[PDB]
Structure formats: C-alpha cells, structure tokens
Design a protein around this ligand. Structure first.
Ligand SMILES: [O-][O-]
Ligand SMILES: [Cu+2]
Ligand SMILES: [Cu+2]
Ligand SMILES: [Cu+2]
Ligand SMILES: [Cu+2]
Lengths: 74, 276
C-alpha cells in the first residue's frame, strides 16, 4: 500500500506537483486537497465525486476545473 | 410536511422556495451549510472515521442535513418544503427545473457562469463565499463532464439490491448504499454531481441550490428501497470502528442516531411513494 511516485509538470500553463507525505498535490504552489479511495483511485476537492486513476489525473482535473482561476488554500 | 417533485410545483411555490433560499443566503445562514458539507467531505476517508459520505451513514447523515436546511427554510416561510429532482425523468437542460423562474440554466461555456435565474451572479443575490476554486459566481456545465444522467432502469437495478450496506462499509462496498452513492456500479448520486458540474461537482456543492433537490431525491430512493425490502435495515448494528453503527450518534449533531432517521414519515411524507 505504498504511495504513488512524485510528479512535476506544466499542464495547461500551470505547474502541478505531487509527492508522498498520505500524498500532497499543489497547483502553482497552492496545496490542493486530494483523497485516495480504497480501490486506488483519487479525487480532489474540486472533483470530489469523480474518481480518476492517479493523483496526477486528479491534479490535471483540478486545472481543467479551474479554467485559469487561482486555487484558494484549503 | 410534503416533499414534492420539483416538476409539479406551482408558480407560487417556486417563488416562495426561491425567496426563502435567498433569505437564508442574505442572513449568512446558508453559507454555513456549505461549510459543514465541505468539512465533512474533506474528513470522511475510507480507512478512518467516515460519517457523511463513503459510509453507511451517508444516507441518514444527508437526511438529517436536509432536515436542518428545510427547518431553516421554514423559519423564513413555514409553507416551504424541499422539493426533489427525479433526474431519471427530468434529464435534459430543458427541464423546467433549469428555467429562469426556478434554478436558472447551465453556465456559459467561457467560464461556466450561470447567466439567468435567481442565483445568477449578476443579480447580486448569490455570492459564492465558501469556495476553493477562487471564482465568486455560481457555475454549472450541465452534461459537460459526463454525458448522461442515470436512467430509470439503472435506478431500478440499484433499488433491487437487498443488502443495505456491506463490510468494509466504505467506497469499496457492495450493497445498496454504495451503489446509490455511486462509487461502485452504474453510479447514481455521484454521477449527478458530476453532470451538473460547477460547484455541484466539488466539496462546496451546496453552493448550488440544486444540491438540496438532488439529495431530496436520493433520500426518496432510500425510502423506496425500504418499501421494496421490508426485511432489510441499516447496518452495521454495533461495534464497528470508524463507522456509525445503527444506535450510535452522528456528528455534527451528536444527539441523533441512524435509528432515529430510518423512518422519514416522522418528519415528512412524499407526494407519492410506492407501498411494498
Ligand atoms: O452530498 O453531496
Ligand atoms: Cu457531497
Ligand atoms: Cu476529500
Ligand atoms: Cu452528494
Ligand atoms: Cu413482501
């Protein structure tokens, strides 16, 4: 049950980072709440009813959701 | 108190529902419901304490949450009750629900902003204050992120499941509760949040007034399930770590148990509900 690998990329113009902590995601340096489901999928607070396979997928879904908007710290 | 299908409300009942919701917003009360739901959805996890979602108490918790909100509406106008949205039937953007005299429609495609109805940002009456996405206007993208609302045949497949819930009592469970919640199977409740989009797809989903109508129909499906399966009841029934057992109390109220909420008729009836 060990955590996913870290990641760091620019996705649609915004920096997304993930790292084991039990895992943290940031969008342009602002932490984004994420959660892992028992089956290994992930969600974020801006997609909290929509499981996706990985934390990077959840970070990318957040950038899609935000449509350029700054994230507020949670 | 009778909860009615939204499609059946009179013009005057829509006007009074809208006015009561806007008064709760103006007074500051509405935002605290948004905040409670977000706090629980961020704390409710599959391998630790879980109360409002991803757990057997998803159903009584939202039943009591909706009762708190309905009683707040009734403090403004005692004739108002929560209507329900049967998304299996009223499944397009042309549903009267989304008309400018009720909830307003979908968001424009540039920024998702709702442009009509009483909750459009331009009215000055619906600031989005409790938020994580920094924008302060109501957003929706109906049918944007998922193509279809559940159908009646899909709902029927879930109603046919006899066990209320199953170990491990979380998002991985088989059984009725998790199939209605939607983390497993053809997906009923979660998919509707995804289908509306905007704030309704996020932890601050009560920012959209349709939240209440969605959960009032999820709550009606629990009542229907009970009529179909009179030999089934809430589980677990004692001694389960991290999960609210039948006779344990639930946060945030601390003074009510799932057992106190199984029978909706102690609080309201529906316009129509099948007999077993
Ligand atoms: O429950 O959203
Ligand atoms: Cu929710
Ligand atoms: Cu979460
Ligand atoms: Cu919900
Ligand atoms: Cu019978």
């Amino acid at each position: 049950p060990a955590a996913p690998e870290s990641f760091d990329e620019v996705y649609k113009g915004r920096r997304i980072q993930g790292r084991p902590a039990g895992y943290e995601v940031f969008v342009d340096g602002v932490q984004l709440h994420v959660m892992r489901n028992a089956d290994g999928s992930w969600i974020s607070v801006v997609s909290h009813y929509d499981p996706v396979p990985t934390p990077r997928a959840a970070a990318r879904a957040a950038v899609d959701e935000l449509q350029g908007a700054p994230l507020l710290p949670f | 108190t009778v909860r009615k299908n939204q499609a059946t409300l009179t013009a005057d009942e829509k006007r009074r529902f809208v006015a009561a919701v806007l008064e709760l917003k103006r007074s500051g009360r509405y935002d605290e419901f948004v905040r409670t739901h977000n706090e629980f959805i961020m704390s409710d996890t599959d391998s630790g304490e879980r109360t409002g979602h991803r757990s057997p108490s998803f159903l009584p918790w939202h039943r009591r949450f909706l009762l708190d909100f309905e009683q707040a509406l009734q403090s403004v106008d005692s004739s108002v009750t929560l209507p329900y949205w049967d998304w299996s039937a009223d499944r397009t953007v042309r549903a009267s629900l989304w008309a400018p005299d009720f909830l307003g429609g979908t968001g424009r495609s540039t920024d998702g902003r709702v442009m009509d109805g009483p909750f459009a940002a331009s009215t000055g009456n619906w600031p989005i204050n409790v938020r994580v996405d920094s924008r302060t206007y109501l957003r929706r993208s109906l049918g944007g992120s998922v193509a279809e609302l559940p159908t009646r045949a899909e709902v029927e497949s879930v109603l046919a499941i006899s066990a209320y819930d199953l170990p491990p009592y979380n998002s991985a469970s088989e059984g009725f509760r998790n199939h209605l919640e939607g983390w497993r199977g053809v997906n009923l409740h979660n998919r509707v949040h995804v289908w509306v989009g905007g704030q309704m797809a996020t932890g601050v989903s009560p920012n959209d007034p349709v939240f209440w109508l969605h959960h009032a129909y999820v709550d009606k499906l629990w009542a229907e399930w009970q009529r179909r399966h009179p030999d089934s009841a809430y589980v677990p029934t004692g001694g389960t770590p991290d999960v609210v057992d039948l006779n344990e109390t639930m946060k945030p109220w601390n003074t009510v148990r799932p057992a106190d909420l199984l029978d909706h008729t102690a609080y309201y009836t529906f316009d129509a509900l099948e007999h077993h």
